[PDB]
Structures are given as C-alpha cells and as structure tokens.
C-alpha cells in the first residue's frame, strides 16, 4: 500500500541500566522501526577520558525487546547484538558516533548518534495488541556521562482491507492475513563454549522458523569483543548421516564477509552466515525434529559465543501450505516479498 | 542499442566568476554527460592555505544548465547543488579532492578533481537541436588558484530507427521517441524560512512532472552548509484532507540515508527523500492539481533552503496513457526502464 | 543444488620463489575457490622494516595457475593481477593485511593476511581431471619474513544427475552439462609500450571467448604500480572503417569505477573497463577473426602494461546456438546465471 | 559378493602437526580400512629417550577423518579415540608398539606399528564421490623422532548389479543400496565436566542413529589418560520415567569389559558399554526425541570427558521399515548381518 514514515514526538531520556518501555501507535500496518541513541557524552573531567571500544558505542542500550500482546516476542536482542548485525548489512555506513576509543576532551563533551532497526516486513500491528518496543539501557561508559534520548522512526504501510483480501485473506483463527511473515530475531547465548582446535558443538538451531542469516562472535573476558579465538566455524547437521553444510576457517568466514557485506570484519571475533547459499533457499526448520542442526566453534581460549538470528515465522505455515497450487502461486509471492523486506 | 563513451576533445579552462557554454556533439542518443574539474589548487602564498569547507570543491562551479535548443531545460543546477545529489547517489565514492578543510602546502599545490553526472535516461539528441550544457564557475578558494580544466565525457546508445519503432515510434508531434524520459533536474532555492520547532510551509512541489528523489539542504549564513538547522522534515499533501507521507526528524532523515546510500550524511545540513518509498512507485504530479503536496522544515535559526529535485517528463505523457493496454505494456516497459537510468 | 563450503585441511607453507601445486578435491561442482596466505611477516631486524608498496601484499603470490587435467587452464594470473582484480570487485573490502607501507616493529611482527578468489561459476569438476591450482610464490619483502601458509576453500555445488538433465543434459561430447560456463580469467601482459599523449595500439583481444571486463594496469620501473602515466585509455574496432567503443581519459574511467564499484582507484595506474556497458551484454569475440579488437594506452612514460580478463567460454556454444527456440530458451537461462555467477 | 584386499602403494610419510589426506579408489563396495604407522622412532640423543605413556603411540596420529563427497562424515574420532576402541575390540592384541614407556637406545632406534580400522560394512564407495579419510598426525614424542608412513589396506567387496537388487535394489533417491548401512563412528568431547560422588550429567546421546557401544575415557591434566577419576558411570533414560539402564561403579563397568573384551584395562581411565546388552539389541534414537538418553560421571577430581560411539545410520531407514513383511524379512536380513560387520 502506501508506505509511509513519521517519528513519535514523544521521546525517552537515556539512564543508566533502567527498562524505558516505549509504546508504538498502531495506526497501519508496521514496516520497520529505527531507534536512535541521540545526544553527547560528556567529560566534566579535567583530563580527555577514552570512550570503551567495541560493542560501545552500541551497548548503551543492553537489550532490545519489540513484542505484541505482552507475549509474543518479535525481537530479543541486545544492543551488541542487533548493533552489530546492523553494522554489516549496511556496509559498516550504520550511525555510530563516537567510534570506538574515541576521546572526550577533558572538559568539553563528544557526539552521540547510534541506530538500531527491527524490520518487522508488514507486521499487522492494526490486528494485534500494544507493540511495547522495551529498550532496556546498559551502563553509561566509565568518566563520561551519556546525555542522550530514543526517538522512534516508525514506518507503516497502508495495507487496506481489499488489498489483504488479494494475498488470501486471513489466517485460519483470522489474527493477521494468510500471507503474514512475523520477523523472529532472537539471539541465544551460549557460555564457556570450552577452546578447542577442532569445532566443538556449540548450540543446535531450535526448529519451529525459518532461519535467513545468523551472526555469530565470542566474548574473551580479557579483550571483550577484540580477540581472535573464533578460528574454526561449523554448520553440522547431526540428524542421520553426519552431513557438513559449513567448515570453514574464521578468516574465510570473515571472507566472504568482505565480498558479502563488502565491509571490514567488525572485530576479530565476529561474522555472518547465509543459509541461502549453503542450504536451497532460507533453512527452514518448521517442522524439522530438534537437535538436528548445530553449529560448532573452535575457540583460541574458553569464552562466551553470542548467536543472533535472523529467522523469522509463519504463523499460517500450513494453510500456506494446504493451499491450491492456484491460490499458493499468488500466496507465495506474498510470502516471498516479505521475507526479505526483513534484512536487518 | 550500442551505448559507448568517448571524453570530447574540446576540454574548458576553470576561470573564476565565467559562463562556459559547452557544445554536446549530436552523434546518437545521449545517456549520461560527466563532467570533472581537473587541475591542482596552487598556493604561492607564503604561508600553507586550508581550502574553505563544504560545499568546496563543489561549489568551484557554481551552476549548471544543460539545455537543447537553448528554451528546454533538462538541467538547472547548482555545483553544490548537483554535487551533493552526486555525493549521495554514489555511496560517498564520487571524485571530489581535495576535500573541505585540506591544506595546500606554502608555495606548493594539492590536487583538484570533481565530478558531476547528468542522466538523460535515452535522450533523442540527434532528434533534437544544440544540446549545450552551460558550467557558470564559480570563485577560486581564498589564498589558492584553481588550475583546472572541464572534461565532458558522454555516453551515446545506438538506438536505431527500427528500434524506435520498436517501442511507439515517435511522438505525436513526432520529435522524439514516443517512450522518451526527459530528466528535469531542476533546483528550487527558498529564502528566509524563519525559524521554528512545528514544521512551517517551505515550498509546494508545483505539477508537471514526476518526483523520484528530492534533495534538500539548508545554508546558513555562519556555517554555510555545516549547521544543524533543518530539525524537521515533512511532505503534507496539502489538497483534501491533510496527510502526511512523512513527518520524520531531521537526524531519522538522514538515517534513511544511512541504510539507503551507505554513506555518512553530507553536512548536519543535508537529506535525501525517496518519494517512491512513501507512494507507490515514483511520486507523479503530471496532472494533479497545484498546491497540492509541500514540504516543510523547522529550522534552529532562519536560513535558506535550497531544493533540487530529479523529476522527470514524458513529452507523449498522454500517448503513453492513450494506448491499447496491448501496446500501452510493451511502451510503458520501455519508459519503465528509462525513468530507472536517471538516478542520480 | 545444494552449495555448501569447507576449508581443506591440509594447507601450504609460503616460500619465497616456489611452485607449490595444489589439488582441488572433486566433489561436486565447484563454485569458487577462495585462497588466504594467513600467517605474519616477521621482522627480526633491529630497526621496524617498512614493507614494500602496492601491490604488496599482493605480490607475495607471484602467480596462480588453476586448471583441469594438466592441459586446460582457467586462471592464468598473477597475485598481483588477481589481486587488483579483488580489490575492485568487492569494493576494496577485500583482506590485505598488512596494508602497502606497515612497518613491522623492530624484533617484533605485523599479520599477514591476504585472499584471491577463483569463480568457475558451476565447474563441473566431478566430470573432469585434476583441478590442480599451481601457486608460484613470489619474494619475501626486503628485511621481514613472511610465516604464512594457504587456505584453500572450496564451495561445491550438489548438482545432480537430474538438475543436469533439467539445463540441457551433456556436451556434444558428453563432457560437461550443455550448459557449462568456463571461466577463463586469463592475464596478458605487454611489454614497453611506449610513452605517447595519443593512445597507442597495445594489444588485441583474441577471439575465441566473451569477455566480461578488463583490468588494465601499468608499471612504471621507478614507481611500480603507483605512478599515474596511464592517461588515455580506448577500445577500437579495427575490422573495417575504424570505431570507437571506448576513447574516455584515465582520470574518467577511474572515475566509472569509483560510481562502478564504489571505492577509491587501486592506485593511479589502473582501472576497469566493462564490455556489457560498451555494447549490448558481454563483448563476444567467440568467432570475430581475430584483430577486430584492441584497446591502446597514451602513456606520460613507456612502461609495462598488464592486462587481466574475466572472460568465459562456452565449450558447446555451438549446441548452445544450435538449439530449438524452445529449448534454447531455458538453456540460456542457465548460462546467463553461469556467466554473472563468474564475477571476481 | 566377492570380498578382496590389497595395499595401496601410495604412502604417507608421517610428519608432526600435519594433515596428510588419503584418496581411498572407488573401486568396489568398501568394507574396512586398515592403516598403519610402520617405520621407527629414532633417539640420536646421548642418553636412552622413554617414550611418551599412554595413549602413546595412538596419539602420532591426533585425529582421523574418514568421509565422502567431503561432506558426509563416516568417522571422526582421534588417533587416542580409535586407538583405544581399536584396543578393546581385539582382546589388546591389535598392534601398537612401542608400548608406552619403553626406551629408545641411546643414539639407537625402536620399532614403531600402529593400527586403526574403520569399518564400513558395505559402503557403495563406487556410487558416491570422493572416500577421502584425513589423518591430521599429532606431535613427535619429546626427545625422538618419527620416522614411519602410513599403510593403507582396503577391502573391497564386489557387490555386482544383481546382487543389489537382491537386497531391496537402491534407496528411495537410489543413491546407495536400500539395504545401506552407513557406520557412523562420532566422537564427542566434554569439557571440564566437575568432580562429584553423585553421577552428574555429562551429556545426551543425540538422536538419528543406532548405538552399538560407546567408549568413554577421561583426560585429566597431570595424569593424561591415566588416572582413576571415572568412578561412577551412569545411563539414564531422561524421557519418561526416570530408569537408568546403568548405574554400574567404574571398577565394574571395566568388570564387564575383562568378560567382554577378555583384556586388562586400557587405563584406569577407561570403559565400553554395549547397548545391546541394556536394552534389547541396539539402542536405536532414529526417531525418539532428543535429550532422552544421557550418560552420567563420578570423577574425583574436575576432567575432560571423551565420549566415543560405535553407531550406525540406515540412509533408508524409512524405507526398510516401510517395506511388505515379505520384502522386509529379507531386507532386514542383510541390514542385519552389516550391522554386526562394522565392530571396531
């Protein structure tokens, strides 16, 4: 329909660890929500103090959480997380002032300008109940003080009720149109995945989604998010005969990353996988048994690996499915539009 | 058909405050005219100049005007202008040394080159007459003389009469190909606007034409075009009922830009608005009505707004809409792909 | 198919000044093989070593060689051309580590880190002979020691005997799929061609293949790759009545590859020229008689020009020509994914 | 069919800290592979070298990899792993010198024979792509240097086009026998498992194959493999209601390995349980839900657990049991006597 985009007036002073739980108006349908870090960070020191380096600036805001109707959870990540999936499928060109390690001069005070962006495709937000965006804030870095607020970008889409009737209607309990794809970008840590020269299991993918890319990095307790003990990535799936979709080298991961995302690798210790190129299409898992598919990592030293997905649901999966090849044709295309508009 | 490119000959000494008329040799069609300020900025001073900030090296040309016949305008730039709209298009990669800010060492030189694009889709230049692409320079940097030159390189497509035909023939007056694209490139400078926090009226986009991106930009008298005036953006379609397609912040503004050009914004002055992302398809106002649909800014200070638009005409606009849908889908396949060359 | 990458496990010592041949497991079809000298230059000098300029790192694999059963090659490049090659084709993203000029602490190290990447579309490499990818290392830079060794990644592609049946089933020959796509990025290099203002013939394109794009640099004796004499570059059909496809200043085609691909030139004496831009589609030299086509270099001092081509060939392009309407019509299909597919 | 063995000529010198792959010839079906590290280890030392204890000399060859097309994966334990299994299953009296401690003359040398076998009951190794088993040797013991290579010894069964279809022909895809048994010899490592009295849990046996045995060892950091940390062993079904199968002290668990495998103890850090004397025949989780079998450990102090499993897949497991009680009771019949093939 009639795409079209406008920021909430009401804005959201950023504190230090507190949960600044934001409503967004259901006026249409919701295509994706920017949230933007807007201010400075401020010295009242006498000496140029040092902003942390990565994740920061992105961990300002600890954790991201965009859900409908208390319960369902669209997103479920942390500022580390979506920050850096939203600095590679961007070309690293993501809003993230200061960089890391830049200096506030003793005195005088830097710039504060991060984003953040949940592409919800076209989440029927009119047919759901209080899309409560909670961004729970994380620690304001040591020596500067952040002075800053959230100012929600909302875009909604037009989508009138002639034009959900051509995409098949409703689903089957009539909650959201036939053809809806809701984004489901968690991210599950793992901790103390032990170090290893040969990939050990890491975490298997859930089934119950259809997953799109995910991104993985390891935190040392040392050097944070700046090591390099990722080394060895692994896509296995264990169901049946042991078969290897991935099983190559970090630096080959970070690689294809390059040509990929045509971006330097955010850190040492971080990278992407498309299921796409290594599977036909997305790597569905809607109806595939559990702990059929984990991914290993052969770590330099014994960390944590966080593991975003880019995965997403269809919450009429099978009448999508028990469709005529007539209508399903049409569905499809739908459904196939869709599940791009969620890049990010 | 054969598109090819070939840099003229004839090249045009930079001299400060001149109009050099360019001549566009009328081989085949025309597809796209880059021109490039190439030389070095000398410094005889004895002392190490710093070349004056943005616009610069744009602004070196202080207008453009790329016209046929010397009464239709494709053109009507400004270096800044156009240079700005090359400085989002092209991810921050367009040819622009040296940058604001660099020092040309005490009796020494830097480098200078910049470039601009005119896209005219498939234009008929054999069809037409004088195709003559007027570059008023603007005035050398304080303290450093330009020494450059202007390079027009332009990209000619064989099309042929058969293939012509192969798309509606000519026009009704039969000047042009019936599927012609005349981009219209135009830029509409605004006076004044006084400064406010509520978007005020700036300027209404008159009909005529069909709007694919607006570029705006305001110019302070202090910091030129480095400021952080323009707060508020807005498109009100201002006909019927008041609507808004976008009522977004400045600082959100320029976050499309992020995710849309992946590149840093311009100046804390600068943005670019898709109008087909908050319409369907490009926004057209061939025949709606006038003061119709204006955009706004809320200012910090009061300055003026400079608004370049790449817009475009259909010369057979109503021929294209007058055809059986049988021959109406294989012109509006031509036209379709025409619109899409003139991006930048 | 099913594509789907891994790292071999056994990888390959860098020495300075050997062949070190490899071989290329013969899955299923391979798509790509990446290749990363991974390791560090050490120096153990007393004061920090400055490594040599660009190419480097790029040059310290003097040359690659991968082809099938000892007689057919399909890469025929140096790191150096590769290496250009690499970093145009992915916006300049590409690892190179360290960066041309890093000095290496004094009795300490810098990392070594580089990659060249080998798309043969959808090689049939089960159906042919040793896929044996002879690298012949270059010189350790002048002071340091290089302590790398290479990764060879492959990405195969789980194309079945049926999928196969579904483009054209075999060859004439039944020797590969009917729609096979052969890379043959070969590298032709030229020797003294001297300084002129006005492009000068430097050598023809042989027939017998479709050339994708060229990547021409020049190598001044006392600048290396980093002088600026290239100036005019132009493609001319010289079969009958002389023309012109390309006769655009060096300054501008570096300037097509800054809106092409986005990053800053390689240096001053190269650049890349598309034939699908200069022409209609790919420029197809399969069966011109040979000499129809040369591209010349005015160049400021007589120096070395090398001239890479991605080019492919179609081992069956008669079949191919040869094939019903009806047939040819979803043959082609594949060939023209085959052929983009081949892009570094 | 016709079962036969022969040597390949080519061998393998075996070098520290290298990946040394092996083509295996497709031949015929393959039933097992032997391999053997047979040369010596050289003291040129003035005083006489003890060799490395325990796993030594299993551990000259760290890991092994034996699988087709790259990707499907028939083994993947270590030279400790098979070495040890390989120990069991042939009362100790598979060759393995020199045993661990023995002292290599003074500026003299000692024998060195090492065996593992992998066997693949009748893997159709002519249907599939690439039998290639990675042997990625581990580190020379300290003071002495090996000096052996490695013997590759297949045994081909002739399987012959009639035969095949005696057994149910090919799968559902027919890309190897209905009546394929592929073995799948994993080994999963856990890390840092705790010191308890009480048998904590150390890990799921994960669903899609057949258990036959399992062999697990314990890797302290002082005593290596021998210590007597393992006192408490423990298979516990999760699902349903809790029963444990095993709840057998270590000291007996290794009791039933004198009965079993009539053979002293490999260490004190070792054991095998056979599924099939704690359930009725094999332990098969081809279709039960995940995390429904763990296997529990007392160890006194805080270690590595390796959990090595002698399972084996059915690629048409469906199939087979899809089958008329006619086919099946004979297709059952071969699937029956490969299963008991693949022992060691």
Redesign the interface.
């Known amino acids: ?7 909430l007036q009401q804005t959201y002073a950023w504190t230090a660890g507190t949960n600044i739980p934001i409503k967004i108006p259901r006026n249409n349908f919701i295509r994706k929500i ?1 949230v ?1 870090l ?1 201010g400075s960070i401020s010295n009242s020191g006498t000496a140029a103090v040092t902003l942390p380096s990565a994740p920061f600036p992105y961990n300002l805001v600890q954790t991201f959480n965009l859900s409908y109707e208390g319960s369902k959870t669209l997103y479920s990540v942390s500022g580390t997380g979506l920050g850096i999936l939203m600095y590679y499928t ?2 690293g ?3 993230a002032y200061p960089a890391p390690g830049t200096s506030v001069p003793a005195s005088g005070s830097v710039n504060l ?1 991060v ?1 953040w ?1 949940f592409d919800l495709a076209r989440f029927p937000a009119t047919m759901v109940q209080n899309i409560i965006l909670s961004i729970l804030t994380g620690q304001a870095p040591s020596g500067v003080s952040i002075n800053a607020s959230f ?1 929600i ?1 909302i875009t909604y889409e037009r989508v009138t009720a002639q034009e959900i009737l051509s995409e098949g209607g409703l689903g089957a309990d009539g909650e959201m149109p036939l053809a809806t794809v809701l984004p489901k970008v968690i991210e599950i840590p793992t901790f ?1 995945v ?1 170090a ?1 020269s ?1 990939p ?2 890491v975490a298997y993918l859930q089934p119950g989604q259809i997953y799109k890319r995910q991104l993985v990095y390891v935190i040392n307790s040392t050097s944070g998010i700046n090591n390099t003990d990722p080394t060895e990535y692994e896509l296995k799936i ?12 970090w ?2 991961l ?3 990353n ?2 990929e ?4 690798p955010y850190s040492g210790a971080s990278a992407i996988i498309d299921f796409r ?4 299409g997305d790597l569905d898992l809607t109806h595939a ?4 598919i984990e991914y290993d990592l052969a770590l330099q030293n ?1 960390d944590n690996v966080y593991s975003l997905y880019v995965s997403y649901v269809l919450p009429y999966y099978d009448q999508l499915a028990a469709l005529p090849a007539q209508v399903a044709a049409i569905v499809q295309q739908y459904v196939a539009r869709q599940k791009r508009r969620i890049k ?1």
């Not at 329909?1 to 920021?7: L, W």
């Not at 264990?238 to 080298?249: C, E, L, N, Q």
């Not at 190129?277 to 036909?280: D, L, T």
């Open positions: 329909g009639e795409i079209y985009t406008e920021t920017r933007q807007i961007t070309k060109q993501n809003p300008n984003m962006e100012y970008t103390n032990p290893s040969a050990i299991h264990v169901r049946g005969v042991p078969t290897d979709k991935i099983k190559v080298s630096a080959a970070q690689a294809e390059q040509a995302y045509q971006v330097a190129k290594y599977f036909n048994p559990s702990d059929s014994q990010r």
